[PDB]
Amino acid sequence: XAXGX
Amino acid sequence: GSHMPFVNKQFNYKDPVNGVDIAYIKIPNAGQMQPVKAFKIHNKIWVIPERDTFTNPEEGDLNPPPEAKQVPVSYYDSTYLSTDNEKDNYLKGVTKLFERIYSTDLGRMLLTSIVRGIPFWGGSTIDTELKVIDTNSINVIQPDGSYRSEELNLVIIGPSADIIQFECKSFGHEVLNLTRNGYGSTQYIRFSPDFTFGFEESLEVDTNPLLGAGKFATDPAVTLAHELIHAGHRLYGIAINPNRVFKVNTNAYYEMSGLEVSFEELRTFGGHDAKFIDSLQENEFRLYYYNKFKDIASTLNKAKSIVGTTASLQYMKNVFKEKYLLSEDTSGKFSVDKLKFDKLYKMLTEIYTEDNFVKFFKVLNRKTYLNFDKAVFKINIVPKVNYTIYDGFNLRNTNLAANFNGQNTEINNMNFTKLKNFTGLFEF
Ligand SMILES: [Zn+2]
């Protein structure tokens, strides 16, 4: 689910 | 990386179903779902060009929630991927990304590990019976209209309601334990080749939640490679529980908000981020998984019979011997070799990383996982004049070839439509 912030 | 293409066939969404590699399918434990048209791009790998309203029947509705309910980094469009033309463009976009990944040595290696990563046949209540686990298959409609069960390793599907969902909102599969016990399970990846994120080329700007509009676009091949790396850990059952976290204290803004980042995400990014994984806990995890692999070897040694299949007990014992690189003595006993274990574990967790893919693609990209997103754009990588297998956005023999100009959304503006800005909204 990942991308995150 | 690829002489013969990874996806050996040009698929159109409207090609007629044949019950083999273009077929109506259902996913296990989502019974009574209407069958969905799916496309088999490679051995063990399927693509479903639909929004994901199936895997998590808590997430069955695509409509935007209340305005005052929506978080800043979220994006809703309930019509996205609703038409045949969109679905055709999705399939060709995903396909082109697999090829871009496979054309690198690193991608070739990671795709190979993934195809080889057949979820373990540990389905039996009987300890000496080898049996498939049902959740590791899909049900495919045959030309006569009956169902057959087909094992697979990987499914690419469309997003759920939140097209830029940045973390899971409840769960993976419930026996996510299969992702952490050596066994591995079939992996479902939500992904779209039609959107990407803008980031900032300066570290000080990219890691600040109040600065930057997102000048440079992330290459979607990197984003897809990121999810494939997770799928790699998860198919070999070596994912680190998400409850193992870094309480981030290396960025002031994460810290003042008490933000936590899972070791699994840091490992997946690689580079300098992976060093934030407590060395003690890293040695713990590795011993834990080694012990899981020994359990697997002894299961296969105790194996007396195999059910739910025509394949030999011996063909399948050897499939897992290869998957887990097991050693075999003169009496035919399997065992886990510490050097081979260390090699396999290292390949999956240190060689296959986001930071490593960036080097192979020669793209600009975020320098750390611990940053703040700036923007989301709509893109279209399908036309060769927009994006290619070999060069992504930074097309050779054009103005876009040098200085990452093709990722520069100011220079290559016709290739990006900005949808939403995140800067300044975060919560600070
Ligand atoms: Zn991730």
From Swiss-Prot, chain B:
Binding-site residues for Zn(2+), renumbered to this chain: H226, H230, E265
Superkingdom field: Bacteria
Signal peptide bounds: none
Function text: Has proteolytic activity. In vitro the whole toxin is reduced to release LC. After translocation into the eukaryotic host cytosol, LC hydrolyzes the 197-Gln-|-Arg-198 bond in SNAP25, blocking neurotransmitter release.
Annotated active site: E227
Subcellular location: Secreted; Host cytoplasm, Host cytosol
Identification of the protein by name: Botulinum neurotoxin A light chain
Organism per entry: Clostridium botulinum (strain Hall / ATCC 3502 / NCTC 13319 / Type A)
Domain commentary: Has protease activity.
Effect of E227 to K/Q: Light chain no longer cleaves SNAP25
